[PDB]
Design a protein around this motif. Structure first.
Motif, mmCIF file in Angstrom:
data_model
loop_
_atom_site.group_PDB
_atom_site.id
_atom_site.type_symbol
_atom_site.label_atom_id
_atom_site.label_comp_id
_atom_site.label_asym_id
_atom_site.label_seq_id
_atom_site.Cartn_x
_atom_site.Cartn_y
_atom_site.Cartn_z
ATOM 1 N N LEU A 1 0.812 -1.223 0.000
ATOM 2 C CA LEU A 1 0.000 0.000 0.000
ATOM 3 C C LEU A 1 0.850 1.281 0.000
ATOM 4 N N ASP A 2 2.101 1.187 0.445
ATOM 5 C CA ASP A 2 2.983 2.356 0.418
ATOM 6 C C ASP A 2 4.469 2.001 0.272
ATOM 7 N N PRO A 3 4.854 1.469 -0.908
ATOM 8 C CA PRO A 3 6.186 0.884 -1.112
ATOM 9 C C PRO A 3 7.351 1.843 -0.863
ATOM 10 N N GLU A 4 7.364 3.001 -1.520
ATOM 11 C CA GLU A 4 8.502 3.910 -1.390
ATOM 12 C C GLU A 4 8.649 4.427 0.039
ATOM 13 N N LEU A 5 7.523 4.766 0.657
ATOM 14 C CA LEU A 5 7.522 5.374 1.970
ATOM 15 C C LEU A 5 8.058 4.414 3.025
ATOM 16 N N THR A 6 7.635 3.149 2.935
ATOM 17 C CA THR A 6 7.955 2.197 3.991
ATOM 18 C C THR A 6 9.375 1.683 3.795
ATOM 19 N N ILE A 7 9.823 1.596 2.546
ATOM 20 C CA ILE A 7 11.214 1.257 2.275
ATOM 21 C C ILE A 7 12.104 2.328 2.873
ATOM 22 N N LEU A 8 11.638 3.573 2.804
ATOM 23 C CA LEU A 8 12.382 4.680 3.395
ATOM 24 C C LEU A 8 12.388 4.612 4.930
ATOM 25 N N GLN A 9 11.230 4.395 5.556
ATOM 26 C CA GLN A 9 11.138 4.303 7.024
ATOM 27 C C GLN A 9 12.196 3.374 7.583
ATOM 28 N N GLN A 10 12.195 2.190 6.995
ATOM 29 C CA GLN A 10 12.959 1.063 7.469
ATOM 30 C C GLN A 10 14.433 1.350 7.343
ATOM 31 N N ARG A 11 14.836 1.883 6.192
ATOM 32 C CA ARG A 11 16.238 2.206 5.973
ATOM 33 C C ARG A 11 16.677 3.280 6.982
ATOM 34 N N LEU A 12 15.848 4.306 7.132
ATOM 35 C CA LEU A 12 16.018 5.309 8.163
ATOM 36 C C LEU A 12 16.125 4.677 9.554
ATOM 37 N N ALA A 13 15.240 3.731 9.834
ATOM 38 C CA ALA A 13 15.219 3.086 11.149
ATOM 39 C C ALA A 13 16.525 2.335 11.387
ATOM 40 N N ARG A 14 16.924 1.503 10.423
ATOM 41 C CA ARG A 14 18.196 0.793 10.506
ATOM 42 C C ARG A 14 19.345 1.765 10.745
ATOM 43 N N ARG A 15 19.357 2.865 9.993
ATOM 44 C CA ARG A 15 20.418 3.856 10.069
ATOM 45 C C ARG A 15 20.449 4.566 11.437
ATOM 46 N N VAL A 16 19.271 4.869 11.976
ATOM 47 C CA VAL A 16 19.122 5.540 13.257
ATOM 48 C C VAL A 16 19.668 4.665 14.379
ATOM 49 N N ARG A 17 19.458 3.374 14.262
ATOM 50 C CA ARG A 17 19.970 2.427 15.198
ATOM 51 C C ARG A 17 21.425 2.203 14.965
ATOM 52 N N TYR A 18 21.862 2.349 13.738
ATOM 53 C CA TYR A 18 23.247 2.045 13.376
ATOM 54 C C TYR A 18 24.300 2.982 14.003
ATOM 55 N N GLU A 19 23.975 4.258 14.163
ATOM 56 C CA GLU A 19 24.885 5.160 14.857
ATOM 57 C C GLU A 19 24.328 5.530 16.214
ATOM 58 N N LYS A 20 23.628 4.576 16.827
ATOM 59 C CA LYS A 20 23.168 4.652 18.219
ATOM 60 C C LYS A 20 22.698 6.040 18.615
ATOM 61 N N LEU A 21 21.546 6.435 18.098
ATOM 62 C CA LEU A 21 21.026 7.775 18.281
ATOM 63 C C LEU A 21 19.880 7.825 19.286
ATOM 64 N N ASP A 22 19.933 8.798 20.198
ATOM 65 C CA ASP A 22 18.877 8.974 21.185
ATOM 66 C C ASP A 22 17.624 9.518 20.502
ATOM 67 N N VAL A 23 16.675 8.628 20.219
ATOM 68 C CA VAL A 23 15.474 8.993 19.470
ATOM 69 C C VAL A 23 14.658 10.075 20.173
ATOM 70 N N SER A 24 14.691 10.091 21.500
ATOM 71 C CA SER A 24 13.987 11.125 22.254
ATOM 72 C C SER A 24 14.539 12.518 21.932
ATOM 73 N N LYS A 25 15.725 12.534 21.363
ATOM 74 C CA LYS A 25 16.413 13.759 21.049
ATOM 75 C C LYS A 25 16.579 14.012 19.574
ATOM 76 N N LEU A 26 15.845 13.260 18.774
ATOM 77 C CA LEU A 26 15.808 13.386 17.316
ATOM 78 C C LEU A 26 14.742 14.366 16.858
ATOM 79 N N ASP A 27 15.144 15.413 16.136
ATOM 80 C CA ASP A 27 14.172 16.352 15.569
ATOM 81 C C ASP A 27 14.168 16.244 14.048
ATOM 82 N N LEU A 28 13.317 17.025 13.388
ATOM 83 C CA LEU A 28 13.208 16.934 11.928
ATOM 84 C C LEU A 28 14.525 17.300 11.244
#
Ligand SMILES: [Zn+2]
Ligand SMILES: [Zn+2]
Lengths: 226, 198
Positions: A134-161
């Motif tokens: 239902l949303d191929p490009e968007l969800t492929i992006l979420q996931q890659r972003l998610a992997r990347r966010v975890r990859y450099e150990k980022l405090d999500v509570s402190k993540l802004d736009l």
């Protein structure tokens, strides 16, 4: 209300024209011009990004465009080879809008940040190869972003736009190189890479350069903004 | 192979006259193959509708998703979808080569390609096709059906008929510039009127 550069959200921020100048300077230094090079541009699909794509094509006649939602590179290794068919220059940018200091910057990145904020970042950290039909490009992006966010150990509570937008740039850049590795033989061609964050300052267009380099004669040289 | 075939500007005449019957100008979504040669029909479409957005993917795959369609629809609506053929669509010929040598899933190294490749497999298996017998215009026509209901699935997720008129123009782009149309309808104020040219 003068230079409109309180955009230091990204230390490297330039005027888009200022930006384009440095590029063709630096690129002429390494043998690239609108003469001998083909440009691949990858932006977000949204219409607000057209100003940067137009400036690039103004300099680069031979050009092709692979825009994906939020700038995701879903054209893949075939999508890239399709366009390159001896000197190649790849431009990849996510994109953000900032008033002074605040229709929607990047729509995808807005929804995603929320996703990471309400649900976990962990809800999106999937194995690569998976998407919502239902949303191929968007969800492929979420996931890659998610992997990347975890990859450099980022405090999500402190993540802004801006922070997220900057993770997208590191992400889209990394994906770009993974395609480039499959699709380009540094022994056969010379190429360049220009990445960064596109910034709509609503009225002035800015660009914050990130990673830049040329691979000439199988030899890589980095380029910083000045 | 494509008995529906027309010249591309005749098509863009019948199409706009047809559309004019109910709507005219209206935002326009264009979805074609990323390949350059698809630009002929693109600009002709834009020629008629100045408000536009494009959602091109490899072979015409609609990976733009619901969000993609919604972001473009923020200013009623008309949707254009066509795969193509001539190196025709390098993508369809790549999937074709594959289909005769071999669920929400994709190759990360070719997401658009392998997503379309999967959706064609389903269309191929559904329609009950002999892959040995399948050639390039067959798969292209299949892809026209795949791309269309894909588009349709996206549409009244994205679009509410009680509040918007929208329209659908689909078909197959053919180079040596021709367009063989296929599924074309309007939905106005509620009522859906299919359209056949001619
Ligand atoms: Zn965007
Ligand atoms: Zn194609």
């Amino acid at each position: 209300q003068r230079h409109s550069e309180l955009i230091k959200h990204f230390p490297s921020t330039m005027g888009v024209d200022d930006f384009m100048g440095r590029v063709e300077v630096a690129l002429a230094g390494f043998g690239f011009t609108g003469d001998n090079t083909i440009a691949m541009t990858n932006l977000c699909r949204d219409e607000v990004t057209q100003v940067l794509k137009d400036k690039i094509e103004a300099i680069f006649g031979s050009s092709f465009n692979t825009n994906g939602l939020g700038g995701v590179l879903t054209c893949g290794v075939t999508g890239m080879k399709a366009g390159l068919s001896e000197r190649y220059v790849f431009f990849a940018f996510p994109h953000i809008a900032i008033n002074s200091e605040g229709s929607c910057a990047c729509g995808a990145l807005l929804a995603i940040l929320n996703a990471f904020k309400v649900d976990g970042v962990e809800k999106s950290c999937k194995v690569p190869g998976v998407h919502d039909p239902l949303d191929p490009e968007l969800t492929i992006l979420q996931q890659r972003l998610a992997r990347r966010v975890r990859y450099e150990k980022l405090d999500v509570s402190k993540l802004d736009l801006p922070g997220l937008t900057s993770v997208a740039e590191r992400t889209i850049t990394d994906d770009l190189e993974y395609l480039i590795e499959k699709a380009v033989d540094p022994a056969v061609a010379d190429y360049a890479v220009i990445t960064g964050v596109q910034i709509h300052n609503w009225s002035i267009e800015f660009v914050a350069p990130a990673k830049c380099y040329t691979v000439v004669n199988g030899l890589k040289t980095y380029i910083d903004l000045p």
